[PDB]
């Protein structure tokens, strides 16, 4: 039984949340913000990601070089990432270097220069990033997947933004973005590892007390997405591996079906020919795929947002003449979540998940990421006892009912990249979303 997550607020409405571990000697402190690319419009799309670059380009006190030196002298590192709904800025350090790291984070968030010279310099760096994501096939597939599933909607936009915006982003719009979005009621200061909660609250009172509050404070993790059944094909005969994602509209963080969708996802599970144990997994799809050499890997996913989600599978295969079989067998395993699953699969998946949700948190950065994610999506850290109860409440009837309303005979978003000549047209893929025998 893990130590209790302590939570305090400041007057502005900044949440401080901590989980101490007296067995480690490092600490991860950082700021989780309930804001990301989705908060941009079409004209300033790319701003949030642009700011992330400039946050490390110098503040009103420390220059770019001084910033570098200060962190080098601390001994640990700083890291940041911007997603569609969430931005994170954290610092991993030694136990007693925590006050330094909180001070640096407070500086780069509140007091960043955003100097025209630096805007202009990064504008090329970010332009080069547009032509090099092209290599990260999983990311290419998932970005096209969001773009098509949420066609012409904010969740459909990329994080980098269009080339056009990169050339026209000004310090004015950068400043406007972080003034509107980086408000105290949207921010959580998180500490995990060798942190004292009371010490962290004091550091918050010292550095984050002059943060603006938003005019209308909504609760943390407050949001209408209209999913489009659709396909993007990026055929490239020169690539040896096909990458395919298939998804349906999934569940939000606060859906009542959140755990049901996780259990369903665990019934299909993951597979990777490179891992020794994968040929012995219990999942039916795993057995079909491994026996017939249909794929190098597959990974089931259930991505959530504040008001929607995507539930589906990502496949990679070199078997270019049997892509049809791979997709066919995958979707017939999904059909069985509607028609055939019983207590046998459901209780097996529950067993696997009860551990999986706890195992994931195996270092201070993972713990901080868990506290930060849960605080910015649900408004609270959910105790493992509550999570164990919600998983236990999932029955086979719940899984069947969920799959019959979410998967069965529903539109999919489909992205294929690589040698995908063998991937059939939309109708034949979508026809596998039901079974004529049932």
């Amino acid at each position: 039984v893990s130590p209790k997550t302590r939570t305090s607020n400041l007057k502005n409405g900044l949440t401080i949340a901590s989980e101490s571990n007296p067995l480690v000697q490092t600490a991860t402190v950082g700021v989780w913000i309930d804001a990301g690319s989705r908060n941009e419009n079409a004209y300033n799309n790319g701003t949030a990601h642009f700011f992330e670059h400039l946050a490390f380009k110098g503040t009103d006190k420390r220059s770019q070089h001084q910033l570098e030196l200060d962190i080098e002298n601390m001994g640990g590192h700083l890291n940041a990432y911007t997603s569609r709904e969430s931005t994170v800025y954290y610092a991993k350090s030694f136990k007693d270097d925590v006050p330094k790291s909180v001070e640096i984070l407070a500086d780069i968030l509140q007091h960043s220069k955003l100097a025209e010279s630096a805007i202009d310099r990064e504008r090329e760096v970010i332009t080069r990033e547009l032509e090099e994501v092209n290599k990260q096939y999983e990311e290419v597939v998932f970005d096209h997947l969001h773009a098509t599933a949420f066609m012409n909607q904010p969740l459909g936009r990329t994080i980098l933004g269009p080339r056009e915006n990169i050339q026209t982003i000004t310090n004015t719009e950068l400043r406007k973005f972080i003034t509107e979005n980086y408000t105290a009621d949207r921010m959580v200061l998180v500490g995990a590892g060798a942190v004292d909660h009371d010490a962290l609250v004091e550091l918050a009172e010292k550095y984050f007390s002059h943060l603006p509050s938003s005019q209308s404070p909504v609760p943390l993790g407050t949001p209408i997405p209209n999913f489009v059944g659709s396909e993007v094909r990026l055929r490239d005969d020169t690539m040896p591996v096909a990458h395919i994602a298939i998804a349906v509209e999934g569940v939000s963080w606060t859906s009542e079906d959140y755990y049901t969708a996780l259990v369903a996802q665990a019934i299909i599970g993951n597979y990777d020919r490179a891992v020794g144990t994968s040929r012995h997994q219990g999942s039916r799809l795993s057995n079909i795929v491994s026996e017939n050499n249909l794929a190098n890997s597959f990974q089931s996913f259930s991505t959530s947002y504040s008001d929607t989600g995507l539930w589906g599978i990502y496949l990679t295969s070199e078997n270019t003449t049997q892509i049809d079989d791979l997709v066919h067998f995958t979707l017939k395993e999904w059909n069985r979540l509607s028609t055939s699953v019983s207590n046998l699969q459901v209780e097996r998946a529950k067993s696997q998940l009860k551990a999986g949700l706890l195992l994931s948190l195996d270092g201070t950065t993972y713990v901080a990421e868990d506290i930060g994610r849960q605080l910015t999506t649900l408004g609270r850290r959910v105790t493992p006892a509550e999570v164990e109860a919600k998983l236990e409440a999932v029955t086979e009837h719940d899984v069947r009912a969920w799959a019959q309303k979410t998967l069965y005979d529903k539109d999919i978003a489909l992205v294929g990249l690589g040698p995908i000549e063998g991937l059939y047209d939309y109708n034949r893929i979508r026809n596998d979303m039901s079974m004529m025998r049932w």
Binding site: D425, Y426, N427
Partner: protein
């Protein structure tokens, strides 16, 4: 008229069955047009972006 009947005594029944066939076949034709268009729309609506390698 009598001789016409003698040549083709099925005449009355034949034309009534024809009326039923015309109605059913016409309806089936109309529905088959809707279904064909429904099934073909992903192909008809397909769009391309080409970026020469």
């Amino acid at each position: 008229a009598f001789l016409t009947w003698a040549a083709e005594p099925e005449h009355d029944e034949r034309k009534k069955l024809g009326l039923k066939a015309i109605i059913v076949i016409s309806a089936m034709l109309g529905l088959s047009v809707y279904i064909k268009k429904f099934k073909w729309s992903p192909i008809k609506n397909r769009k391309f972006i080409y970026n020469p390698p």
